[PDB]
Design a protein around this ligand. Structure first.
Ligand SMILES: [Zn+2]
Ligand SMILES: [Zn+2]
Ligand SMILES: [Zn+2]
Ligand SMILES: [Zn+2]
Ligand SMILES: [Zn+2]
Ligand SMILES: [Zn+2]
Lengths: 103, 104
């Protein structure tokens, strides 16, 4: 169920299907994206905005410790490329906390 | 507020790895993945000790937080080579429950 949620996140991101995230986000999910805080449905709306903008995300690598996952992705928009770290904590099959940080 | 206290302690542990502070914040059930290699409990303390013993210099670049999840970006210097490393930590009840260390 832990692994399910992480796997669904990757699939959702690859597919550009933000709505699929609703299967792993909860109303109490907290996200920090470069210091900006979002909760619950707002997290889905942020991911939707990212997809709407056509931002291209490629997974580079990932690691896991217990219910904690850390992903390194490359992000491309308008020919500019950046590395981003995405940390998630899963509880009861749901992503409860997420940090997105530009490197 | 209480965040600043916790941040200060976490940063000190990450940069300097004081053994006595490590023993206070690691529990027998703490799980660490360091570039895919898994360590648990006391082992985590021993790994931090080894990193410090080798003279690896760790400096905070930035960090973020959401609930009990923290993410630190550090520079690591060893033998004239410099790299960026991401450290993700989950805290529960004043202790580190999970930590991932990943070279970028
Ligand atoms: Zn699309
Ligand atoms: Zn909405
Ligand atoms: Zn827009
Ligand atoms: Zn110290
Ligand atoms: Zn002492
Ligand atoms: Zn030992």
């Amino acid at each position: 169920e832990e692994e399910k949620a992480a796997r669904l996140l990757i699939e959702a991101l690859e597919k550009g299907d933000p709505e699929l995230m609703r299967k792993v986000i909860s109303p109490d999910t907290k996200m920090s994206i470069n210091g900006r805080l979002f909760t619950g449905d707002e997290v889905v709306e942020v991911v939707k905005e990212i997809q709407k903008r056509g931002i291209v995300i490629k997974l580079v690598s990932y690691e896991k410790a217990g219910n904690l996952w850390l992903f390194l992705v490359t992000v491309k928009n308008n020919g500019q490329e950046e590395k981003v770290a995405v940390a998630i904590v899963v509880r009861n099959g749901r992503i409860k906390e997420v940090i997105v940080m530009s490197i």
